Amino acid sequence: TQRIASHSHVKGLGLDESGLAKQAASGLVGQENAREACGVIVELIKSKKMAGRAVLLAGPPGTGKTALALAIAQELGSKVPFCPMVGSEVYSTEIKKTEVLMENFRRAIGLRIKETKEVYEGEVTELTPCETENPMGGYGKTISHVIIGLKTAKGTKQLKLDPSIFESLQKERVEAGDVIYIEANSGAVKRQGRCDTYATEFDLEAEEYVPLPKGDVHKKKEIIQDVTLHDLDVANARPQGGQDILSMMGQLMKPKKTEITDKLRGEINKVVNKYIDQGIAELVPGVLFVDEVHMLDIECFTYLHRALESSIAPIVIFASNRGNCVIRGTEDITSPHGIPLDLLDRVMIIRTMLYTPQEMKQIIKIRAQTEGINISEEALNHLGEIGTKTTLRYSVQLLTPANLLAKINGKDSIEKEHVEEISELFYDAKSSAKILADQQDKY
């Protein structure tokens, strides 16, 4: 069965119908004003009205700012793009820092385009060129159509096809008992292989046999396909239909990322507007989430000023555990959250707060009953006391190694002695830092 992450319990923001926040719901506990704020941001995103509105989830390490940013992805659901990142992803060696931001600004916007696929496929039982009873004057014979017999596990039928098909039926080495297909929107015929019925006609033959198709000879579905605008940007920047020397050379060579021009973005914006206006394509604007935003350079921050203002851009979520740090890529310049004051002016900051001990105990209980672990009430009370002495990501994290220790020591649930044994085996940052300072001459 599926393995469990650091966030698998986060199922949503768990808001009331009025948009207020419950003490503990949808796998979250506390942070009520920040969950209420993310409620407003979920309405902001779900409205599709806005571009480049941005929020910064500020607050100390292990206060749930990454959890709330993922809770938003659950409240939106998988139908709209949520594009996660860390500030450190921008440090590509193939492409400039500002262009990696622009790609993530283009991954966070999805087309949702619907089209019919219609195809004729089956084992070909005959090719029967149908002559007309008279040729036209001066010709020995003339064919109005080729009959092709096709079959599948549901049945057989003849198709009547344009005489120009017959060249394609000897370009492909078609012969009766092959299985073939024909795109009804294009009229090109393709060969899949000998049908599996004939796999016993030799002890060996140099072709993979294809299982006899099922469903009717003529097939239809409408299918709704999702592409981000970054998929369109890439497919136009590096074509895949490789029947030319430039494309083969460009496909044998290393598949290097490239600094896509403002012009391609322009031409794609000019075409998807056509297909949204024609009611072919829905647009689903979404979210770009950057965790660890304090890793961006002052060059990257001074690019986000254009990017967050641009009338195309997604909603953007930032997170930062940093205090009054220096802005990366300058020696002196300190700024709150590690983010420049002129970018920090452009973002709606959401304050995230330290947990009180009684919330930590409730979070640890939710982790236990989602990691699959049963724990005694006195052990949980001790584990929340460890949380009080340390941090949430230490105290939560002792649960599994306490479960291994309990299992090995013949018990199907955590008890007091396991939590104090694991705490003796494994240190946290605050206890290890004391051990370093007491030994600093030996390291």
């Binding site: 590509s92 060996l204 033959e205 140099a206 496909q251 230490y394 599994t400 003796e424 370093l436 300072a437």
Partner: protein, 434 residues
Amino acid sequence: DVTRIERIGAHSHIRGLGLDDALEPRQASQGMVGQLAARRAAGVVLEMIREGKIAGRAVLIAGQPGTGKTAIAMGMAQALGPDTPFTAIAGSEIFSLEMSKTEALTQAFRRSIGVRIKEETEIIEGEVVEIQIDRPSKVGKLTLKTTEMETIYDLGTKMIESLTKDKVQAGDVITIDKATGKISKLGRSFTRARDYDAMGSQTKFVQCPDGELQKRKEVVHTVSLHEIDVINSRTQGFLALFSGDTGEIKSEVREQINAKVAEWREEGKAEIIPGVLFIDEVHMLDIESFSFLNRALESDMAPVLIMATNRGITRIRGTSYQSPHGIPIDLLDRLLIVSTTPYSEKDTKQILRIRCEEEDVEMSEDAYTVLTRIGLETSLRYAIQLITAASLVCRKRKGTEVQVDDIKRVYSLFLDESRSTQYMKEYQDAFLFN
């Protein structure tokens, strides 16, 4: 007699992580000594790795230089064994000149997850004795020999073209996957290795196959998840699995692989075996790299990380900021820290015996006493380096068991950092720069 390529390295004696079934570590077993607290902790994370139930876990093995941090890791790697991935890197292996520090870590993570697969097959495998055809479409036969049988196949129209385009001859050994029809020469049969007397620029002789000629079976493969990412990066991407040309794989591919591998795992077609990523000397990572680990430890399919580090409260690379271990606090509370403890004389004598057991060396108990003092007045890893040189002086001296006189000889030949530093200061201005 014959020396294998793999031979006596700095950790060769550890052949596990010596634990009883209750995860109680023995004073000395499986080639490991002492570290009883850190070896319980290593055993507990070794069971966490074997369960695989959870993702993005991490451990930091901290402690002084020469106290077994790489030894616990390279021991745990063998208690885990093969069959589960254990990628080991030094922290400075990720500073590539063709991909970012976050790609080189992403590839290091993805190489530590094993997708197991069942695959059903049939392969024919043997010496082709002769090929025969009619002459007009063509129909023909060919004969296969293996150590147990000589047998003949009726073969189709495209097979005759494939054999004649591939230029097979009598006495070649071949394999074909019948379901795919693809031919493959392995070489010429060893009983045939004389019927030509100058050999074409590549040919190779193989012993003729044995057992059943058309083996029909399912096989299990383990594919590390990174290969599934690389194979999809460009049309012939699999060459980069060896050339290393894996230049920054597009994120749209990796999320498609996660979706497909999760779909296979629900259908039961594959099973995801979580491995370990061991980043030895993790303090070498940049702040931009540690801040990437902060999210990589949250994927629903990250490995278990292990790290080791010698650093005190020390500067994080690429910053002026000082932190425990040279690692940022925002990673250090995701980490769960195991602390190794310096050796007693008792443990130090035990380990120097286990190096002599491994190096195949006899020493006097007077020599172990003097060596243990040296390895306790100066770093353990210097005394571990004296004993090989003591064996080589003892051989040159025509001895057999090394004596105190041979230890004191090597101790006069080869210095440690303290005697080297002191005699350097006694001539200081003759060296360059300070």
